[PDB]
Design a protein around this nucleic acid. Structure first.
Length: 36
DNA sequence: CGGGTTTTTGTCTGGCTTCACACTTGATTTGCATCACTGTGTAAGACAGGCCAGATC
């Protein structure tokens, strides 16, 4: 486990509520994680 | 020579499981080339005994 893995496991429901479908969801997650 | 008998070949409707990108990134191990350092088989390389012929009193 790493910081990115923890952030993903913590904010996956965010992308879930945002878009159902997870290419674009994971892309946006990685983008916002690299931004923050 | 034509017909019969297996044998294999599929059908839609509706219903189960089941492996694969898709990014996501950043560690992990995986693999081939490189590094340190000698022992040795092998081929170049003089080398002196032997065999000579040219030579002098």
């Amino acid at each position: 486990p790493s910081a990115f893995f923890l952030f993903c496991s913590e904010y996956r429901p965010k992308i879930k509520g945002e878009h159902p479908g997870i290419g674009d969801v994971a892309k946006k997650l990685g983008e916002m994680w690299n931004n923050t």
